[PDB]
Design a protein around this ligand. Structure first.
Ligand SMILES: [Cl-]
Ligand SMILES: [Cl-]
Ligand SMILES: [Cl-]
Ligand SMILES: [Cl-]
Ligand SMILES: [Cl-]
Ligand code: NA
Length: 129
């Protein structure tokens, strides 16, 4: 599924991500924009052989099982395919664990490089929320 900007904001709010760990909704929408362009089916292979999955590009090295990332962990206790679904519940639940791990949203490289320090409220501006 390719979400619209306000549609994704609304779904993230319904799943409790707005202000989670102190990160306003625009931070989460901005991160999804630059991680996946709002496409739940996005996948990208990393040089180390791990793969990033879904709207928030969650990595199989630590967070989900894809069966092809040796020596990796599965800290969200989910198959990585669950992170590609049109319903964002699994991605949100796993993102909540990631952002609680100590480094906040710096876990998402695109957030650090393209969202952090910017006017992230622009990503939810105009949306009926
Ligand atoms: Cl957009
Ligand atoms: Cl915001
Ligand atoms: Cl594996
Ligand atoms: Cl959803
Ligand atoms: Cl933080
Ligand atoms: Na894994």
């Amino acid at each position: 599924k390719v979400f619209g900007r306000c549609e994704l904001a609304a779904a993230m709010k319904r799943h409790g991500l707005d202000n989670y760990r102190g990160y306003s909704l625009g931070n989460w929408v901005c991160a999804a924009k630059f991680e996946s362009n709002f496409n739940t089916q996005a996948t990208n292979r990393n040089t180390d052989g791990s793969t990033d999955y879904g709207i928030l590009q969650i990595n199989s090295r630590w967070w989900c099982n894809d069966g092809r990332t040796p020596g990796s962990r599965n800290l969200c206790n989910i198959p990585c395919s669950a992170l590609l679904s049109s319903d964002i519940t699994a991605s949100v639940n796993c993102a909540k664990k990631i952002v609680s791990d100590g480094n906040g949203m710096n876990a998402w490289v695109a957030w650090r490089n393209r969202c952090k320090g910017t006017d992230v409220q622009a990503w939810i501006r105009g949306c009926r929320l």
